[PDB]
Design a protein around this ligand. Structure first.
Ligand SMILES: CO[C@@H]1O[C@H](CS[C@@H]2O[C@H](CO)[C@@H](O)[C@H](O)[C@H]2O)[C@@H](O)[C@H](O)[C@H]1O
Ligand SMILES: CC(=O)N[C@@H]1[C@@H](O)[C@H](O)[C@@H](CO)O[C@H]1O
Length: 606
């Protein structure tokens, strides 16, 4: 268009499909396969990115330039990688992805929002939208353009170690919370075609609905195992939120490690190509999970040639290798060179990858915006997270008998109060998994406000606040306490080790609640990623609050304990009486819950 060295794909005024086709028709097989390859930052260097025409990088959980890195360190890392990609012959910018699943959670100082189960308790899709918006800003603060979220798993058994990543056992709640998508990506246009990818621009990020499909239905909630259920239950429980995601223009879809009636999702042509692509008309890109194609075989990794063939023929577009890029590229090249994988399949994968990159404006803004750095941890975002944490809490008990004075809301003025328990002053525990590290961690791992700090920030200046993590019964009886706040619950976990058959919280937890509550009236704040065995905690407590994993802003808990707002959260999951009942979901066979889905007591603001 009017310039002698004009190249259509580099013209920002041209339609996405014309730019995609113009670039595709120029590309070598190596350039195409390179687009289909995502690698860890851990194995990336400028030479590797350029020489192998790499399409994408990620940080997996915990993969950071260093502990404590600033927003600008992250931007410089990403820009460094981008500079190498932009130096290739075609200058195709890479997309950098990360798990920003409750805020930009690998990053020191990022606001940490409640995990999804808690957000399910809010029944507030617009709140979740706003969390998508703020999350996109904090992701862009670190120069990253792609978030592996939302997890739209419908967790059907809380024994799953990722159940906290599911908004609900009820697909309708999960469906409603796909509002995260236009938060992260921006609202789609008036006349948008369902299935088309969308990202508004450099202040938004590409999203990822994950993990397709039936990841929350696995047998015994075993991570990555088999989901046994007929087409009718897959389609009526596990699938419908994918269609909501298509309707809101989700840019990518990550495949599950799990199998459906014994067929690995990473090899399932019928569901990946026949259904997602050809029926839902998904036109963005399909990405593997981490070594997901390796896991097609048993043992994993034992026929990588097969893994590459099966996956790429099933319809996956981009492979999260994430380490052995040379072997992946080599193998896929050999398959294409020997006619095992046709060029039409490569061309489809590359079309989709490029369609997402061009749509989102990556060719126009490949580099980080330094003015966005200050969005990290922004106080407006913390206020939003604090609102979310507050709305997530479900009050399960407020008085031992129907005749007692309600314990909550507590008075902010009292001569002396006790805050106690393993979880009262532990930021990492109140954040849970996928915070700083993959598995979360213990202690002051980022910037936030623990429940103890929140108490001290809320009470009258005459109120003496005593902290003891695990006091004995005598300490409490002698203390002259008006009341106690005791917080206990689960330790941080994920998939690999959150898979638990007993669901009873670690000691000391119960023993501390018993010592505290046997001495003074007590409000027990239970921190968990899921329902856990709760009868003994309930029997000891005057009041008991399921706080889930509320994130960095512990003042959302005290906002409700001290009556600045009323409790409004409702269970988004069934609370079982015994683990022997499981699986047990609302609508079931012999449904006998301790608390049904939807239960929650309320209070009025004081
Ligand atoms: C050592 O195992 C660790 O696994 C985690 C989770 S596996 C997989 O990771 C994807 C990319 O981070 C997620 O989007 C997806 O939800 C998960 O199933 C991984 O992050 C670590 O890199 C890996 O070390
Ligand atoms: C402490 C308190 O006022 N609780 C009340 C409840 O008794 C009443 O039914 C409702 C009506 O607004 O508001 C709430």
């Amino acid at each position: 268009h009017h310039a002698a060295d004009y190249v259509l794909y580099k013209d920002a005024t041209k339609p996405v499909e014309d730019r995609v086709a113009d670039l595709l028709g120029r590309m070598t097989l190596a350039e195409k396969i390179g687009q289909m390859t995502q690698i860890e930052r851990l194995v990336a260097t400028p030479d590797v990115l350029r020489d192998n025409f790499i399409g994408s990088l990620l940080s997996g959980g915990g993969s950071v330039p260093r502990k404590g890195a600033t927003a600008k360190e992250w931007q410089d890392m990403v820009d460094g990688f981008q500079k190498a990609c932009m130096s290739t012959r075609l200058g195709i910018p890479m997309i950098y992805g990360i798990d920003a699943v409750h805020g930009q959670n690998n990053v020191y100082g990022a606001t940490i929002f409640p995990h999804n189960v808690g957000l399910g308790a809010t029944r507030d899709p617009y709140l979740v939208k706003r969390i998508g918006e703020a999350t996109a800003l904090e992701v862009r603060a670190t120069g990253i353009q792609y978030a592996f979220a939302p997890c739209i798993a419908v967790c059907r058994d809380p024994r799953w170690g990722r159940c906290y990543e599911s908004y609900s056992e009820d697909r309708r709640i999960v469906q409603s919370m796909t509002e995260l998508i236009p938060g992260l990506q921006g609202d789609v246009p008036k006349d948008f075609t369902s299935g088309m990818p969308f990202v508004a621009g450099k202040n938004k990020v590409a999203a990822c609905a994950k993990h397709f499909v039936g990841d929350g239905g696995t047998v015994d909630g075993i991570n990555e195992n088999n989901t046994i259920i007929n087409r009718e239950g897959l389609m009526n429980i596990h699938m419908p939120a994918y269609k909501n995601a298509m309707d809101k223009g989700v840019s990518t879809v990550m495949i599950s490690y799990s199998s459906w009636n014994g067929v690995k999702m990473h090899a399932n042509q019928d569901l990946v190509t026949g259904y997602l692509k050809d029926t839902l008309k998904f036109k963005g890109f399909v990405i593997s999970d981490w070594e997901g194609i390796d896991r097609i075989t048993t043992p994993a990794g034992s026929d990588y040639s097969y893994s590459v063939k099966a996956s790429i023929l099933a319809g996956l577009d981009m492979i999260m290798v994430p380490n052995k890029y040379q072997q992946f590229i080599s193998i896929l090249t050999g398959h294409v060179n020997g006619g095992v994988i046709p060029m039409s399949r490569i061309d489809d994968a590359v079309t989709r990858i490029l369609r997402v990159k061009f749509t989102m404006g990556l060719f126009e803004n490949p580099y980080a915006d330094p003015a966005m750095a200050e969005q990290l941890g922004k106080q407006e975002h913390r206020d939003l997270a604090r609102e979310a944490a507050r709305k997530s809490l479900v009050l399960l008990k407020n008085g031992k008998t129907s005749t007692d004075a309600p314990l909550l809301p507590l008075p902010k003025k009292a001569p002396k109060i006790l805050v106690a328990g393993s979880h009262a002053d532990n930021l990492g525990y109140q954040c849970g998994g996928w915070t700083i590290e993959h598995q979360g961690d213990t202690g002051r791992t980022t910037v936030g406000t623990t429940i103890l700090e929140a108490v001290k920030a809320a009470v009258d200046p005459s109120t003496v606040v005593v902290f003891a993590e695990n006091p004995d019964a005598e300490f409490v009886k002698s203390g002259g306490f008006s009341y106690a706040i005791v917080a206990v619950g689960e330790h941080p976990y994920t998939e690999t080790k959150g898979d638990n058959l007993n669901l009873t919280i670690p000691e000391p937890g119960l023993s501390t609640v018993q010592a505290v509550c046997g001495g003074v009236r007590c409000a027990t704040v239970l921190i968990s990623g899921r329902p856990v065995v709760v009868q003994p905690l309930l029997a000891a407590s005057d009041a008991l609050v399921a706080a889930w994993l509320p994130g960095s802003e512990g003042q959302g808990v005290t906002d409700a304990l001290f009556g600045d707002f009323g409790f409004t959260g409702r269970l988004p999951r069934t609370w079982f009486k015994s683990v022997d009942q499981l699986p047990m979901n609302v609508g079931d066979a012999h449904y006998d819950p301790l608390f049904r889905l939807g239960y929650g007591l309320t209070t009025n603001a004081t």
